[PDB]
């Protein structure tokens with residue numbers, strides 16, 4: 001009852017599109033609070049409503065909240081003024097510093113520390129999937145009922161599942177199974193995105209050949225303005241043994257220390 005929003009309360013403006021996914025579409029909406037409304041133009045209804053209960057109960061400053069569900073069902077989400085983290089760091093109008101970028105990474109880690117503590121596996125962590133609000137607070141997003149595929153370029157087929165190979169751990173590429181430890185691998189790649197200001201990872205690699213490229217003894221290179229301790233953290237995130245990768249709690253700890261050494 002706490003998850004359901006009355007159809008009287010929501011106005012969804014289909015003329016103004018925020019983004020087009022594969023399975024649905026997200027629009028500007030009004031609830032007076034400005035929101036984003038995900039349409040699903042099917043799946044089990046039982047599993048849908050129970051997923052919305054888990055999601056609604058997630059409350060963390062660095063995790064995207066679910067405002068609610070309007071009864072195809074409509075998923076109501078907060079409005080995020082500055083859009084996704086990747087586009088934000090690529091914008092020629094914005095000037096984040098090295099400290100700012102490490103800080104964005106710290107916020108994500110805190111968001112993921114929160115999600116990991118609820119035994120929730122994100123599966124698609126990447127800068128494109130983190131959103132910023134008006135206070136430039138980074139929110140880990142595109143999970144649960146909100147989950148879709150918006151930048152088709154970064155997902156590759158084959159089970160004919162369409163997967164973000166360039167963000168995936170070795171074992172996930174082999175087994176197609178995702179864990180919090182494979183989320184940790186994705187977080188290392190996200191750290192790399194931040195320090196290169198939204199560069200595509202492994203440009204001259206194609207698709208599932210990534211496994212062969214990694215097994216060559218390769219990792220993403222250190223960005224110029226990435227601090228040495230931050231690069232060492234990335235390498236730990238990409239440990240070949242999943243269980244030897246740092247927890248998000250350890251990552252929050254290590255990154256908060258690096259962050260604190262910078263001014264401005």
Ligand SMILES: Cc1[nH]c(CC2=c3cc(S(=O)(=O)N(C)c4cccc(Cl)c4)ccc3=NC2=O)c(C)c1C
Pocket residue numbers: 018019020026035036038064077078079080081082083084128129130131141142143146147148150
């Ligand atoms: C001004 C603005 N807002 C947004 C996106 C946006 C959300 C994305 C999400 S999401 O990461 O969970 N998600 C489903 C999503 C992920 C990528 C692209 C898009 Cl359009 C949506 C959730 C709430 C949002 N509120 C928003 O305003 C974008 C991409 C822009 C340019």
